Write a protein that binds this ligand. Sequence first.
Ligand SMILES: *[C@@H]1O[C@H](CO)[C@@H](O)[C@H](O)[C@H]1NC(C)=O
Ligand SMILES: *[C@@H]1O[C@H](CO)[C@@H](O)[C@H](O)[C@H]1NC(C)=O
Ligand SMILES: *[C@@H]1O[C@H](CO)[C@@H](O)[C@H](O)[C@H]1NC(C)=O
Ligand SMILES: *[C@@H]1O[C@H](CO)[C@@H](O)[C@H](O)[C@H]1NC(C)=O
Lengths: 122, 120
Amino acid sequence: AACPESWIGFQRKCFYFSDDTKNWTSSQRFCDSQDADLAQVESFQELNFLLRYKGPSDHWIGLSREQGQPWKWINGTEWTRQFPILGAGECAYLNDKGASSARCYTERKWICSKSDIHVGTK
Amino acid sequence: AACPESWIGFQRKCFYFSDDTKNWTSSQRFCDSQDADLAQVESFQELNFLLRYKGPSDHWIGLSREQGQPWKWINGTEWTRQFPILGAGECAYLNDKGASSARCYTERKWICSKSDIHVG
Ligand SMILES: *[C@@H]1O[C@H](CO)[C@@H](O)[C@H](O)[C@H]1NC(C)=O
Ligand SMILES: *[C@@H]1O[C@H](CO)[C@@H](O)[C@H](O)[C@H]1NC(C)=O
Ligand SMILES: *[C@@H]1O[C@H](CO)[C@@H](O)[C@H](O)[C@H]1NC(C)=O
Ligand SMILES: *[C@@H]1O[C@H](CO)[C@@H](O)[C@H](O)[C@H]1NC(C)=O
């Protein structure tokens, strides 16, 4: 199977949409336990898939920042600015129509992403 | 890739959700051209997944009937009653409750499904 059971496949990745709510760091610890990360949204097409599937509640994704800084990926590098992220918060999430930001201690649903099983990067 | 580009993978199948609208027979022709069929919805659970992604438009699916007669999948097997397909029409589609039906010449979006390329 390209993706784990109950994950959703889309363009060489596998996505998990949570049932539970957790804070941002706890959501990342959950994704890390599944050999994945909080969604690393790398194109506008991926964004659109996520907004369409997720349904009505806010979902954490894997971008964080410091107040006067750029948004960073989980690996600590500045991200590629595929879409605007609104608000004045430290952790990013998806809402009804796009990406916004809030404090990392708030409990939200989350999305994990990883590569499908047939992807090689060598 | 398990699925062709932009199809959504779920539980060893791939699903195509159209952006365009067609009548039911031409929708099944599109699906067949991409080595698939109009979605042969297998169960209430598969239903809940298609309902999650499809968004507000009506989408044709792979069941139809002759007047009076039981619903049949594209493959010829009679529907197994995991949920009702409502209405008075010959051709089935998904609204946001579950399945409803209409005249086959009208214009709706559609969903295709097929087994992913690693099934065997
Ligand atoms: C996040 O939530 C956990 C319980 O899930 C709590 O123990 C932790 O202190 C909270 N905040 C952070 C930043 O870990
Ligand atoms: C860091 O993570 C991002 C998001 O997946 C990836 O696109 C980028 O190539 C990675 N950068 C490094 C230096 O590993
Ligand atoms: C017809 O398709 C349905 C829905 O997936 C499946 O349950 C049934 O086994 C199929 N019959 C054959 C012969 O493919
Ligand atoms: C359905 O549409 C196709 C064109 O894609 C056409 O050949 C066919 O006549 C239409 N069927 C009906 C009943 O209007």
